Design a binder for these strands. Structure first.
Ligand SMILES: [Zn+2]
Ligand SMILES: [Zn+2]
Length: 704
DNA sequence: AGCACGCCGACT
DNA sequence: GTCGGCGTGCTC
């Protein structure tokens, strides 16, 4: 008989072999019910052949075959298989992550009638306090008066079906089945909204994409906000939609502004399906089949929407391609942008990466000749060198602050991220604590009695006096969630303070990250970036870029939305070249410079990076386990000169809570060479018996 | 991951 | 004398 290698939803980097009951034909990509020691669990058959590696007598059989045809097209299958090894995640978790939950649970991949609880119209007219002390029946009807509740979703909510049942008894609610709907849109597909009123460059862009709309093509569409990136998306979609092919457009988690959705639903008289994290499992399933069956012209979604099955997909476009939201950071740590062009190239399709602030790596491939580029077309910097600081603010700015709160306006003050790792700086002369081993910046660690370089793990006592000018007023950098509110309120009394990370009125809102493109602040007239020092002297080589991204966003947003609001910058080094080139020459010029020196130090995107992080409860066991794997990695047959593994080094968040976090960084000029290096070294991880008593994670191409 | 087996505190 | 803590280990 034949050997069924089936992948299982367990964190084990390998398939499991079983036998077919002869007469059973399951191609790879089908779900099979299969015994797994003590449980009965589902698996995708990764491959069926006629040669195993263990006694065929021991090998249990497969219980049942749940799919006649694979639930993956060959393109998305190949794509998942490649990503499983490039990212080094257990193939079973990768394959399952890519399916609707109901398909991970072995239910049939066909349409099923959806049952919903709805409020009767007495249920929407009877006074809600009429049953005020009826426990949850009340809050159940509350939720009902905002929309239909699915039966199986009730379990996730605070109330139970008992309440809904008691309501149905009292005539307030009722259950029913929303029968599906068939739609043939390809016949009689027009466009509402308007006819296009494009200008010259948008026209040229649509032409360039159209003249290649069939072969693989990667287009970076670069244009600042309001230059009509979306427009040329909808013209591109139109052309692709005329053929009868389908379109997939991806946005950030917080990029689903009903503004953007309502615009798409108007332009086409074809079905659009939009996937936001708030849909239940039945809505996610049916959308999966509607897309695959062709009954859906357009799918709009986020990171996960990349794995959507398409009868005939014609184009895929991702907005705000620079957004970090496209890199999952729990579990399987894939990057939807990179996997997107892979799915685009393997489908022979145009991919459109639209951005107002393009990622440095995509700019790097544009230059390298792998994407083509399609283009569309006050302030004050305040030197803090010596000025007395009032809770971290500069006098020349606090006075320019009150003048803005004077007219009952609002103000955003932007700091570095929560948990930023701080440098050391001389308040008077600008000298920064550098490492005596590499020309890297030292990370200060006040409670630990020492400095510590994150690139070479050196240590030095905290120097009490500046070794270039001699001021005793040596300060850290970055303020973040240190409750600037506490030091701030005494100076701005009766003025409230809040945060904008997840009406009118004069106030100060601190910020730690970039704003959402569909998230404006109407009452804000003043924005100041206090994060320039932390950005420019960080242990994170990407801090500058993220800053320069935030700067060009808040400079164009507040600067020319229609009011003349001001941006102020607070650096101990206004003379800095990268800082100035950004300020007076724009993001693209800064980018070209930042790219050109990422190369001199040999970091992404010129090199490839891989972070292995492990944490423990004693600070002694995780590091040395990494030190062993470090030594084993270097002993790989494919190691040569270019591979470097710095570490082990404590993570930039040393002890989040009680556990202690250490990490090891691998880098190499060749992405797949390094993929082969760790891929081989990973099959022999059982050599180190401690790899199963630390919590270890593997992060390919990290964002940090 | 599940779900074992496997040796030491508070309870009938 | 129990019923139960989760510390290592396996699952074709
Ligand atoms: Zn100094
Ligand atoms: Zn160093």
């Amino acid at each position: 008989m034949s050997v069924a290698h089936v992948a299982l939803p367990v964190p084990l980097p390998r398939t499991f072999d079983y036998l077919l009951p002869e007469g059973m034909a399951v191609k790879a990509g089908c779900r099979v019910r299969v015994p797994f020691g003590k449980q009965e669990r589902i698996g995708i058959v990764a491959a069926v052949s006629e040669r195993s590696e263990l006694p065929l007598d021991e090998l249990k059989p497969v219980a049942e075959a749940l799919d006649d045809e694979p639930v993956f097209s060959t393109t998305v299958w190949r794509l998942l298989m490649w990503a499983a090894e490039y990212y080094h995640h257990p193939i079973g978790d990768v394959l399952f992550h890519a399916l609707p939950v109901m398909l991970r649970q072995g239910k049939p991949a066909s349409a099923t009638p959806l049952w919903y609880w709805f409020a009767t119209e007495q249920g929407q007219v009877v006074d809600l306090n009429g049953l005020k002390r009826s426990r949850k029946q009340q809050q159940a009807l509350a939720a009902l008066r905002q929309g239909k509740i699915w039966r199986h979703q009730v379990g996730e909510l605070e109330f139970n079906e008992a309440a809904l049942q008691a309501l149905r008894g009292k005539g307030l609610a009722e259950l029913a089945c929303e029968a599906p709907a068939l739609t043939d849109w390809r016949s009689a597909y027009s466009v509402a909204g308007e006819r296009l009123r494009l200008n010259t460059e948008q026209a040229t862009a649509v032409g360039a994409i159209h003249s290649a709309a069939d072969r693989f093509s990667a287009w970076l569409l670069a244009g600042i906000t309001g230059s009509g990136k979306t427009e040329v998306y909808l013209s591109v979609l139109e052309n692709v939609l005329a053929q009868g092919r389908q379109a997939l457009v991806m946005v950030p988690e917080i990029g689903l502004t009903p503004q953007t959705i309502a615009r798409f639903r108007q332009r086409f008289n074809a079905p659009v399906e939009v996937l936001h994290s708030g849909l239940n499992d039945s809505e996610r399933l049916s959308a999966w089949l509607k897309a695959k069956n062709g009954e859906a012209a357009i799918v709009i979604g986020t990171r996960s929407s990349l794995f959507t099955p398409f009868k005939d997909l014609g184009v895929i476009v991702i907005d705000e391609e620079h957004d970090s939201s496209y890199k999952q950071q729990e579990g399987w740590r894939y990057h939807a942008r990179d996997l997107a062009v892979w799915r685009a190239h393997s489908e022979q399709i145009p991919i459109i990466l639209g951005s107002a602030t393009p990622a440095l790596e995509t700019l790097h491939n544009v230059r390298q000749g792998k994407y083509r580029q399609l283009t569309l077309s006050q302030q004050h910097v305040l030197d803090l060198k010596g000025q007395p600081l009032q809770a971290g603010l500069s006098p020349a700015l606090i006075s320019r602050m009150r003048q803005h709160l004077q007219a009952d306006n609002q103000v955003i003050l932007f700091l570095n991220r929560r948990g930023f790792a701080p440098a050391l700086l001389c308040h008077d002369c600008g000298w920064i604590a550098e490492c005596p081993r590499c020309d890297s910046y030292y990370t200060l660690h006040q409670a630990q009695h020492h400095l510590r370089c994150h690139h070479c793990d050196s240590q030095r006592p905290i120097p009490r006096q500046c070794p270039s000018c001699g001021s005793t007023h040596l300060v850290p950098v970055g303020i973040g969630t240190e409750q600037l509110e506490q030091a701030l309120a005494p100076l701005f009394p009766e003025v409230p303070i809040s945060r904008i990370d997840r009406r009118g009125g004069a106030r100060i809102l601190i910020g730690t990250q970039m704003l959402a493109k569909g998230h404006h602040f109407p009452d804000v007239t003043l924005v100041s970036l206090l994060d320039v020092d932390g950005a420019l002297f960080s242990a994170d080589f990407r801090s500058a870029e993220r800053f320069a991204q935030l700067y060009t966003q808040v400079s164009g947003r507040a600067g020319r939305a229609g009011k003349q609001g001001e941006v102020i910058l607070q650096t101990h080094h206004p003379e800095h070249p990268l800082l100035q080139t950004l300020l007076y020459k724009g993001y693209d010029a800064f980018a070209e410079q930042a790219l050109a020196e990422r190369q001199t130090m040999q970091l992404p995107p010129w090199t490839s990076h891989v972070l292995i992080r492990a944490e423990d409860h004693n600070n002694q066991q995780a590091p040395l386990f990494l030190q062993q794997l470090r030594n084993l990695l270097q002993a790989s047959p494919l190691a040569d000169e270019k591979l470097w593994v710095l570490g082990p080094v404590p993570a930039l968040a040393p002890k989040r809570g009680g556990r202690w976090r250490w990490q090891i960084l691998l880098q190499h000029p060749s992405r797949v060479r390094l993929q082969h290096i760790v891929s081989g070294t990973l099959a022999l991880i059982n050599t180190l018996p401690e790899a199963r008593k630390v919590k270890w994670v593997l992060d390919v191409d990290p964002i940090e």
